[PDB]
């Protein structure tokens, strides 16, 4: 008996350490699983954005030129969306409208440059795409002075002159639809809020949701996926060791009782 | 007596076995939920990522903004050209598809008044940008020289919107191959059956080559998002029971130890 005491002392001392090593874990677990919920939440968030902006560059044919600049041809200067820079903040929207689908056309030197640019497309299943042969592009010029010409508020290389005078040549920038009425139908004009009134009577309008900008997201998405995968791994091995502790505790607990009875006997 | 407490011990151990039996059942059942849940999660993501891309390509083209314009109540909207135009003879469609492109996502309306009320609605809800065709002010296009097969000859459409249709392909002619339009490149709007386009502005466009599955796809996702709730919920409830049973067996094991002890006090005595 006087020796049976130093037997139950160690045991409990070990079970105490267990309940100790247990809490020490639940803290981590509670901390990990928590930080994960946050990272996964910001992951699905930026996960959407990536797929979105990318899904667009397909329909818009943007990812096509990116993978088209990976080939050798003399004559290719890329799309207008890249070769034109608007001034400061003000007309961004306006000019984006005056171009819209035209800001995806790829400029080339001669018709032969385009004919072979297409082959790369049909020989790789990439999709349709528009090209502008500098030696054939018929530029457009402004006659009547109504609003500040959309061409006078941009900065483009002087070699791709005709290509821009074609996409924005007869395009003007006006303030409100009221300043346009006097000429709607005569001159091609777009308002600052995005309201294009084509000389053909066609009207374009609407406000989207705009929030390289893509490459950055890929970097951020990869980062999160890494953080995620790591956490899941850790957070999982802990939940394992946790039970490892719990099973031992249940097992340790049974042993103590089987002895507590023994002492009573003695 | 000693045999009385002994026959009472077997009564508990008999139950303890049952708990451990059902516990096994739970374990198995739970393992079956995880595997399936893990499978649903897969299809969900694999299929949900498509909506993020589909619903994104509906904004680019404007297909979404259009549909939203149907549940507006702004009488005057008639729809998309692509919806109002159809090709009578097949294998001649690829040409027209190319002859349209962006122009195909155009919405036909009565007048510029519907145009405004449509644009204002689009802005008020940031649905997107869209180009309208006011049949009231649209200016049709024609073809003087017959250097090929007119685009309008292989098309069917309600004579009531003839203007908008002649607006997109009014000056467009369908030819056979590249070397068939050369004599008139940048002179007339060419569109080879192969799938090419030679605008009068010298601009050349060509390449490779329904958006109606987004509705059926949004459903399949709404389904998986609903099926995951089921599986994910059923698991936490079963896992909860599994824990309850484990608490029970424990409760018995200590009791069984005490029962075991009394017989050793009844075996050392008797």
UniProtKB/Swiss-Prot annotation, chain A:
Stretches assigned to the SMC hinge domain: 75-181
Cellular compartments annotated: Cytoplasm
UniProt record similarity statement: Belongs to the SMC family.
Function recorded in the entry: Required for chromosome condensation and partitioning. Binds single-stranded but not double-stranded DNA.
Complex formation: Homodimer.
Domain notes: Contains large globular domains required for ATP hydrolysis at each terminus and a third globular domain forming a flexible SMC hinge near the middle of the molecule. These domains are separated by coiled-coil structures. The N- and C-terminus interact to make up an ATP-binding cassette-type ATPase domain. The SMC hinge domain mediates dimerization and binds DNA.
UniProt-recorded name of the protein: Chromosome partition protein Smc
Natural source organism: Pyrococcus furiosus (strain ATCC 43587 / DSM 3638 / JCM 8422 / Vc1)
């Amino acid at each position: 008996v006087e020796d049976k005491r130093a037997e139950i002392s160690e045991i409990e001392g070990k079970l105490s350490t267990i309940q100790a090593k247990r809490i020490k874990v639940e803290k981590e677990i509670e901390a990990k699983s928590n930080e994960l919920e946050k990272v996964s939440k910001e992951l699905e968030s930026s996960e959407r954005e990536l797929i979105a902006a990318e899904a667009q560059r397909e329909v818009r044919g943007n990812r096509a030129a990116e993978e088209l600049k990976r080939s050798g041809i003399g004559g290719i200067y890329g799309t207008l969306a890249e070769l034109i820079k608007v001034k400061d903040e003000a007309y961004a929207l306006a000019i984006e409208v005056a171009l819209g689908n035209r800001a995806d056309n790829v400029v080339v030197e001669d018709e032969l440059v385009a004919e072979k640019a297409i082959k790369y497309l049909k020989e790789h299943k990439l999709g349709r795409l528009t090209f502008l042969p500098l030696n054939k592009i018929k530029p457009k010029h402004v006659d009547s002075s109504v609003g500040l010409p959309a061409v006078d508020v941009i900065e483009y290389d002087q070699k791709i002159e005709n290509a821009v005078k074609f996409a924005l040549g007869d395009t003007v920038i006006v303030n409100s639809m009221e300043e346009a009425r006097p000429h709607i139908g005569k001159v091609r004009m777009v308002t600052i809020e995005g309201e294009l009134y084509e000389r053909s009577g066609a009207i374009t309008g609407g406000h989207f949701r705009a929030r390289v900008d893509t490459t950055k997201l890929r970097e951020k998405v990869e980062s999160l996926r890494r953080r995620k995968e790591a956490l899941e791994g850790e957070l999982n091995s802990l939940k394992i060791e946790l039970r490892s502790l719990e099973n031992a505790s249940f097992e340790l607990r049974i042993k103590l009782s089987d002895e507590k009875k023994e002492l009573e006997l003695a």
